[PDB]
């Protein structure tokens, strides 16, 4: 399945995802798409794919995409988390950590494109999580880059860490929320189990966990050292040693073998397929699995991966190529 989703209720794991589109304002399934799209970059952004809304008191041209869980049946307030990076391992690429072919595979947003078996991705986040070695951005958040050695290649999705789970992601939320405060400009308070973000005067060294019912609760701590409050000073600090620039060591050979498009190039015949009804070669141009079988005689809509005639299940399950 091209679309995978995370389903709370009662799946708790990466399911198939049934892609549907609706109107922006009225929000029904009465939409006329101009084009029926190429990639997750269409579907993830609000107000990209636009067309014509059918049911007639509704002039909102732009549409809204939503993903549902493709295993057991659902109702409308179900909206599952769309996993846009992770597709099935159709081309059969190895993991860059481990010479193993497993399905499906994560694809990081990096330039040469690096992919991975699933169980490593649990290991990669948590070893970074235990050690604290993520990359925190102001706008995006507290995420990891590409694993091989790729600059400017962060995953743009907090909800992908829900594959790690309600235990780990909540811990990720605590460590992430702490990670923002140093970059914003604060310190975590040193009382055991309090963590009060408090703002005293500049001049006053003695700051106290003060509040009442919540927050403040009996601890006067020194500003520089964070001890019980005193007049003079504490002992001296340790020498610092700057790293500053760090050439991240990448493996040449394994990075070749961990490429999503090639690595070794198994899928070669994926360009022209014999259509059943007509019996003619037709070329697949770009993203769309949905291909029109482009003959004066024929005129027929058929799916590339399936082969049979284009229906809403083939629309929903795997609309576009991954």
């Amino acid at each position: 399945n091209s679309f995978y989703v995370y389903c709370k209720g009662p799946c708790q794991r990466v399911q198939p995802g049934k892609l549907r589109v609706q109107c922006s304002t009225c929000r029904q399934a009465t939409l006329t798409l101009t084009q029926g799209p190429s990639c997750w970059d269409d579907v993830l952004i609000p107000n990209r794919m636009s067309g014509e809304c059918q049911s007639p008191h509704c002039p909102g041209t732009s549409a809204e995409f939503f993903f549902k869980c493709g295993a057991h049946p659902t109702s409308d307030k179900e909206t599952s988390v769309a996993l846009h990076l992770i597709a099935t391992n159709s081309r059969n690429i190895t993991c860059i950590t481990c010479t193993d072919v497993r399905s499906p595979v994560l694809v990081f947003q990096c330039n040469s494109r690096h992919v991975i078996c699933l169980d490593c991705f649990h290991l990669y986040c948590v070893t970074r999580l235990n050690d604290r070695q993520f990359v925190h951005d102001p706008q995006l958040g507290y995420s990891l880059p590409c694993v091989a050695g790729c600059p400017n290649s962060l995953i743009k999705e907090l909800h992908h860490f829900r594959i790690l789970g309600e235990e780990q992601y909540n811990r990720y939320q605590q460590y992430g929320a702490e990670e923002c405060v140093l970059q914003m400009g604060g310190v975590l308070c040193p009382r055991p189990g309090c963590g009060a973000g408090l703002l005293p005067e500049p001049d006053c060294r003695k700051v106290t966990c003060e509040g009442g019912n919540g927050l403040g609760c009996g601890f006067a701590f020194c500003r520089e050292c964070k001890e019980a409050y005193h007049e003079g000073e504490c002992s001296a600090v340790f020498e610092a040693s700057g790293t500053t620039t760090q050439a991240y060591r990448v493996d040449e050979r394994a990075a070749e073998q961990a490429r999503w498009e090639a690595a070794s190039k198994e899928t070669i015949k994926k360009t022209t397929k014999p259509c059943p009804r007509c019996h003619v070669p037709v070329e697949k141009n770009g993203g769309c699995m949905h291909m029109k079988c482009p003959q004066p005689q024929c005129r027929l809509e058929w799916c590339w991966n399936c082969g049979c005639e284009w229906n809403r299940v083939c629309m929903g399950d795997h609309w576009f190529d991954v």
């Binding site: 860059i96 950590t97 481990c98 010479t99 193993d100 169980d119 490593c120 290991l123 990669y124 070893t127 050690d131 694993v147 091989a148 050695g149 790293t243 760090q246 991240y248 060591r249 990448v250 493996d251 394994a254 990075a255 961990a258």
Partner: protein, 154 residues
């Protein structure tokens, strides 16, 4: 489990292909994580003796790298008294997932054969190796025959 998938492919490769300097690879059947090996120095003054190493690959592998612990006293200013060589490639702050262990041994043995006092641990040995090249040679002659293991037969 994961490291066992990792390392049995590597252990078959490194024993079959053979690192030549690195010899006497004592690896356990059940205990895959501990690898012991006898490195053979070729440059003076370490080729007078021979040094054993025990690389302890941890539970989380290969996300965290192992610690190459020597079970040998060696007269060399990177490595300390107990058994902790200082290696740039085995680092936490700088690490790649796709690291070959023989690549670390290529890092290690070149480090053993060519002494770095630019990034050492011990102060007087790094002081001595930078300042008095003869005396560090002379002490390493006396040290390594006394402490280090014998030269092999092949």
């Amino acid at each position: 489990m994961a490291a066992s998938r990792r390392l049995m492919k590597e252990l078959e490769e490194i024993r079959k292909s053979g690192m030549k300097n690195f010899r006497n690879i004592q690896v356990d059947e059940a205990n895959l994580l501990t690898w012991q090996g006898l490195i053979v120095p070729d440059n003076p003054p370490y080729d007078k003796g021979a040094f054993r190493i025990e690389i302890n690959f941890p539970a989380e592998y290969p996300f965290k790298p192992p610690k190459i612990t020597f079970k040998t006293k060696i007269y060399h200013p990177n490595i300390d008294e107990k058994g902790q060589v200082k290696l740039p490639v085995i680092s936490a702050e700088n690490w790649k997932p796709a690291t070959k262990t023989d690549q670390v041994i290529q890092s290690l043995i070149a480090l053993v054969n060519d002494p770095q006092p630019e990034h050492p641990l011990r102060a007087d040995l790094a002081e001595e190796y930078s300042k008095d090249r003869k005396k560090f040679s002379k002490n390493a002659e006396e040290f390594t025959k006394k402490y280090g293991e014998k030269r092999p037969v092949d």
